[PDB]
Design a protein around this ligand. Sequence first.
Ligand SMILES: COc1cc(-c2cn(C[C@](O)(c3cc(C(C)(C)O)c(F)c(-c4ccc(F)cc4)n3)C(F)(F)F)nn2)cc2cccnc12
Lengths: 1359, 57, 114, 69, 55
Amino acid sequence: NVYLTDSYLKGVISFSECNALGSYIFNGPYLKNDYTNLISRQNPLIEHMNLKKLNITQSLISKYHKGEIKLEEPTYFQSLLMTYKSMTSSEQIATTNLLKKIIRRAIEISDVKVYAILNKLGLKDTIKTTLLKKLMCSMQHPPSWLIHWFNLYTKLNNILTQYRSNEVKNHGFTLIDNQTLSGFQFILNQYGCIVYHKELKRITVTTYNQFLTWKDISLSRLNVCLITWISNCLNTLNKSLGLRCGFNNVILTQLFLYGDCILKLFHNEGFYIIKEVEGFIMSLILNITEEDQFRKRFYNSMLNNITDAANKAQKNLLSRVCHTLLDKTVSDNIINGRWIILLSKFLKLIKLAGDNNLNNLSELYFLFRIFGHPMVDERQAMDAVKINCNETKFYLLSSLSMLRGAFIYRIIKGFVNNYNRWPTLRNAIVLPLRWLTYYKLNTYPSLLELTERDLIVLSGLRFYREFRLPKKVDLEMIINDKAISPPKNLIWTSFPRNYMPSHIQNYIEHEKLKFSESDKSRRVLEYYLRDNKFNECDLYNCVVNQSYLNNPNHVVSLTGMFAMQPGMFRQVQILAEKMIAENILQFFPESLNNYISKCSIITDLSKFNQAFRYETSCICSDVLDELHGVQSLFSWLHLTIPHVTIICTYRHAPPYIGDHIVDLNNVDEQSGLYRYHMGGIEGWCQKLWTIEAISLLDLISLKGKFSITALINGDNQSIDISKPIRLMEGQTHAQADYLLALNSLKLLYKEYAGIGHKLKGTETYISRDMQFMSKTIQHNGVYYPASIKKVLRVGPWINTILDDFKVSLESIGSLTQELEYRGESLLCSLIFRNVWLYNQIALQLKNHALCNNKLYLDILKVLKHLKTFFNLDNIDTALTLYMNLPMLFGGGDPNLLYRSFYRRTPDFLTEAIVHSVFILSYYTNHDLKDKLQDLSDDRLNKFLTCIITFDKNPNAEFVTLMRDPQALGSERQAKITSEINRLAVTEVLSTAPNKIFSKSAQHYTTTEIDLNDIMQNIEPTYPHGLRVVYESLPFYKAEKIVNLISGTKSITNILEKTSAIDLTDIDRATEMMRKNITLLIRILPLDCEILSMENLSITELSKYVRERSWSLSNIVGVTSPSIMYTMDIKYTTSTISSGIIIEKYNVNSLTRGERGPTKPWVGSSTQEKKTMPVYNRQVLTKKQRDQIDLLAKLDWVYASIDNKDEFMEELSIGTLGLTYEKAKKLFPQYLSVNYLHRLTVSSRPCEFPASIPAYRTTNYHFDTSPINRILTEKYGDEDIDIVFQNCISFGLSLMSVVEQFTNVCPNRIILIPKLNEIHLMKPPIFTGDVDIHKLKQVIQKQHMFLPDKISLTQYVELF
Amino acid sequence: NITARLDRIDEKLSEILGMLHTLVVASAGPTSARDGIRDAMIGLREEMIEKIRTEAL
Amino acid sequence: NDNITARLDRIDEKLSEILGMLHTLVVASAGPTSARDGIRDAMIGLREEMIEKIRTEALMTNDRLEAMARLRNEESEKMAKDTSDEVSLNPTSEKLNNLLEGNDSDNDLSLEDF
Amino acid sequence: ITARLDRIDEKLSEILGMLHTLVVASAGPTSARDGIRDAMIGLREEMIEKIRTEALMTNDRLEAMARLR
Amino acid sequence: NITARLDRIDEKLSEILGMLHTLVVASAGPTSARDGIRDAMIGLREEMIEKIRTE
Ligand SMILES: COc1cc(-c2cn(C[C@](O)(c3cc(C(C)(C)O)c(F)c(-c4ccc(F)cc4)n3)C(F)(F)F)nn2)cc2cccnc12
């Protein structure tokens, strides 16, 4: 039962926590004169008392109360730290040598993959490559700023690691240290951080999250400098190798220093100014991509925004520090307005960082993150929201009618386009004469034939129930690892018992005895697991009866803004949303002389929640309720929120509760608590508001006589406007476009004001033609990525639970792959990933929190084993080789070589084996441009022999293949986290008070055995068909819930109401990690007839390994050759007319950052052909349609089953509730013959893109005529196992890679396949029977997760 | 032109119906829901009617 | 057939009066009541009547002249300056603009005195 | 035929009266209110009959679709 | 013909009158009218139950 703290900022830095702690320590207002300090000094916390009562804390307080030391805000010390240059000669030497060693090791590790790639492409000490020899010669001496950032990160990380280890060992540990960081004195604790600087006589009291943020800032700046230095060295070596952006380290260091100075002069509020940096950057971009009028307007609005933000920050800080203990801390440069100098210089630096280049100005978006996160105040933020959410809005009845009519018109248009029918109106008499003709003929007028009169007429239509409300609640949508607000009467339980008065505590203790345990849960998963009165149709009964209206328990809780509501009001909040996601977004597909003039308007929609009132949202949500037949399900918000008491329920931000006040509705309104919130809460009903915005844009297009195109990507929308105009004499295109933009701006401002959304000029801006959706920059068909922004947080234990090793390596590889896929640099991403992998494995492994050096001892065992096995020179070479072995066998390299040439593959084992072959060619001196043969060095022979010869221990083959159709078995693969914890999760869930979960957990093992026994008799095992069988049974839902639960920390304490990790889970995870680490010594025993490479096909070898592992006679449909091995690469004229030809249509030698003529290569997966039978498809819910599709897929793939009739009768009677012949009328009829490459399940890649940005694919043209003719001659119109899309993607990506490594893009490449690697694939006849009794048992045991049955009336209405 | 006048009158009546319906929808606000009279302006729909019919057995 | 035409014209005049009254109807949101103890109904009125109600602060709002200009179909100052042919520079942004232009390392910045 | 037009005109006059009374009522107190929101006709069963008719039509449709069983 | 349009106008006027009555008496302020509407709806629900189950 230990406590493990975070290593990265996984939450928010708290203003209230810092205020309370610093106000208790120093006995006076610290950051703000709110109620937090009053209650934190009147009634302190135990953790705060423990922090204050230390000897060093008492010494510091005694120093301050005299006072020799001065109190400062956390940002002062952030600025002080990030410039700490007080490094002695010994420390300088130590850090320089450590960084040199890390760089050398990473380059040595990367040399293996570079040699493999260069040997495959034929582009011809511990470094055998001349390229990386030169790179190391360049990289011998690190720069001073990089050493500074690395040293600072190392020291902060050492502090964090020491505290985390000694807190896992000893509970309540407080780390006091003044030696690691010279000058500073840290008192660090999971609930505080007191920093004292002696030489400057300064002191602050901040939180643990702020220390995590400082560590993250140091890591981010270290990563930026690492990437910049690597890229600059590569570019100096070759202008194509590194990233496209060319940066300057000195300038960037100056940017960090000046941003910290800004954050120091201004206090916390200084982040406001930083918040505007993108504005400047955006303006800079426009100065290359825009004309005079647009760019000048944007520049002026940018300057106005920046300076208004600065003035607001100054006013706020001066009004905030008025009566605190920081009143003397305000700089004299804030009072006299001298900051306007410093800020200017900062902006100048950004321009110097841009260097009038789109690449640098696009990459420069990391500046928001390297300066840390603001100490967010909660009371002030939600008061600012209240200001805009209590305002009365005045509406013109004509405007409301027009909006509702546009919504109804879009609904009708979607129905007619999709269902080829008008929704059945219940008062169709309204349609006067012509709309009646449109209704009877089932046609709709085009937008250009539409008038405002027509929309006002349409605004009067009422429909009949046209959609289905699911009776049985889906448990995959209402279950998550997120907190839940307590009920209203129990809301006081969100604040510490010390902070609440005596009467509140007595009331809480007397009310916890009146609420069921599920209510007092504080977490969603605990809310449902502890619900002993759960019903499958409680949600439907709530919606139908409208039990969420006028409910005394409704409350809204604002935390880090993230709002939540108690229990059932949450599930309704999802249910309504869910319905809009299925039944209504299909109608709104965009929610995911004689001169044509075009403009674009980008609007920040993150303020819709405040603007929308009932009178605007209801006019469309009522149409949605009418379509679904419910009364007020999509309008619940505005009929429920007004009557509730919105409260900020942060732990350290309690309200001032009056004398004898126990009810939240009678609490006096104040900062941190308000009522009568007329409007929407951000996040809830987001889909409805997006739909409403699209309807408004259609109405504006009608009112403006221009064609329109909307793209609403979440909280920001782009509107593309086109109008045909009679061009004036002398007028140019730019003036016409600008005039159109201004007129459309005025019109949409008028309309948005018409619905009471007073648009602000700071949010909306206009551009001629550039679109900046998906947070990416696109100029004339060229993509400029902010790749560096995503690889900032690449540290050792990133995105993991219990500091897992395999998962952290997976995350490191995935993150550092963005410098490859987006940034377009193989070598830069490779070296960055190797730097951080070496840091995680060689250095940070022996500093684990829970198993301090158990993993390092195991990794040393593995290295000794690999030295003995492969006959390596020493353990350095053993680590280098381990780092380049696939995680399927070993665990070093998380990114296989195929990922450098195409994203998706359908056979991981073959790619892993080919990667191993290529890697071991580094040591065996094997040529990769020739065939496989037996030579003197038999390291590869021994590896392959140990791969194929192993003792087979099959167990539960069929359930494992249903769960992971790519699984190996016989304990030949590394077990995953969900596999290990599945048994523990079931043992935890079996005792849950909820009968639905306990019953399904009690039968879990027996149902698994039965599920293994269903399809054991079919001889030619198809794992993907087994997956189809899996998803069509109710065990899939139970498995998904169990897998979701198994991903959390501290499974055992899930029902124990603790945040501590049980020792059982700690030990289990430790053993899992050790077994996974030693899997490499288990896979390759020292004493393992030798496989002969003469006429060896790795496809057959992988097929044999997969079959032998499960000891199955035949496994089909999961083995596909590796494209990177199959296709030899030629760069000269094809004298034999064989192989795919990829040619460069661009005329420039370098094709990076240039768009060509050809169409983009999306990957283009070929889908299946099916004749959908005609019936009223809207009568079936989404679950029923998915089940019907799955059963039809089974009927297509299992048409050869000897007892198909009984098997499908049982399946349809059990799941769908219909007989086989009744359900067969609804099954899609798959015209395609071959199901082994046209089946579509989640286990198959839906797309096969290249490892390059889409635009880049336009530079090249692919021709696959000769290989197609040869393959159709050899196989005669029969599907083979090699993926065509992956062949094309491999060709394109290797053209890009040869350009990178050669500096000259190839004129033409030819991919000549290896014929023996390609094998025919026909759909086989599935001889054998299906165990009907076992299938019935599987259906019955987990019947509680069965999808909705198709009732007799539903089938009748279905036709 | 009598039919033309009748058609114009019918279209104006249709506009009146649309405006009055939108006013009815927008006037059935949270005050009505607190009152419990929203279903008077909105009307019983398929779900509630089916639930009552099941209860009426 | 003059009497039928007269009847149709009378009906048309009544329809025109109804439509003219409806098209100018202003709907007020169902915001909080006075003293913030209770919730008010979604009251409706004529355009000028609701404008005068805003004038008599009878319906609490954070902005008045914007709502009046919108209802009167007028162009208030805020709308006029928000979307113009050019965006005027706030004086502080003016100073920042002279400082940004003419970059000559003469801004007289002293970081160590901070 | 003219009787139909006369009845239509009577209905339109009733509609004008209804709309003007609605606007006056929604205007609020202190302007045209002496009593506590005086009922201007008092017939609240008209919407009751209308809602009963609409619910009867919907129930009839549902029962007709169920009768196909 | 003329009679069809007259019937359509009659239906439209009936709809307008019904919705106008709903708006006019829905704007009632005092609690007496609110409680009367709620009890009338309860009685309507009971009558619907009885009329549905009469067969
Ligand atoms: C989605 O999951 C999978 C998919 C495919 C898979 C394989 N193929 C290719 C294909 O069979 C075909 C047939 C012919 C004939 C008919 C002999 O002329 C060809 F000539 C070529 C061809 C010609 C020139 C080239 F350069 C390259 C390929 N291609 C196709 F396209 F029909 F599907 N397409 N999909 C295989 C999988 C294997 C295991 C697990 N999943 C798989």
